[PDB]
Amino acid sequence: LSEEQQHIIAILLDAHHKTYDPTYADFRDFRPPVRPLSMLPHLADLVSYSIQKVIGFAKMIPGFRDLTSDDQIVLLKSSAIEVIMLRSNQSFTMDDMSWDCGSQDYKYDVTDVSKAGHTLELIEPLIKFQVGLKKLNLHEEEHVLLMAICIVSPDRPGVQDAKLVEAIQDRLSNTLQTYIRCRHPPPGSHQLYAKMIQKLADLRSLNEEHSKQYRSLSFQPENSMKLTPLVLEVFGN
């Protein structure tokens, strides 16, 4: 575990502590939850707020700001929803399979999110992903590395410079691999790196399902009205 990679882990931890509020104080600013697509204005506000936080995290990733402005946008458009699902694992609890954010009120279950349309085709695999991510019992250092590796992916559609993206991801991947050996003891570290990259593959199919869900729902202007301008810009055309 080198000079350079302890620097990286310190940066990502601080970046996360600045972009994820464990007290969830800003939830008062959202449009109120009502439990029709009753919850969508509240969840749209939650997602929109979370995209801002994901962007703030991404900008602090060592090597990210050295990318083009255009490559940064490509990486955030494709990765935003995936990092949101990753970072939501902190609020997700396995007592009742819900995201618990202080009150409830601000706690969300499958009935809160899968009532309308074909959204269960996304929610059922997403809950299973949350359970699977939770059973990894990640160190916080591993949690923030995985989000950063998720953001800086060289295979996102539309990436121009990919070698540099790969270079930035490799230095994060090799930080995660070396961290698991030196800091994660057995048996919890057994194939832990392979199980984490597997969760990156789960995010890809959850992202693909998400794009199909969003496209169908945004196609109805009545529901697109309830979203936010940021959400529409990022989850785009």
Binding site: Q52, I55, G56, K59, S69, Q72, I73, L76, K77, P229, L230, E233, V234
Partner: peptide, 10 residues
């Protein structure tokens, strides 16, 4: 073509 996202970068 992403005014808000570009502004959230810098």
């Amino acid at each position: 073509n992403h005014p808000m996202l570009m502004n959230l970068l810098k």
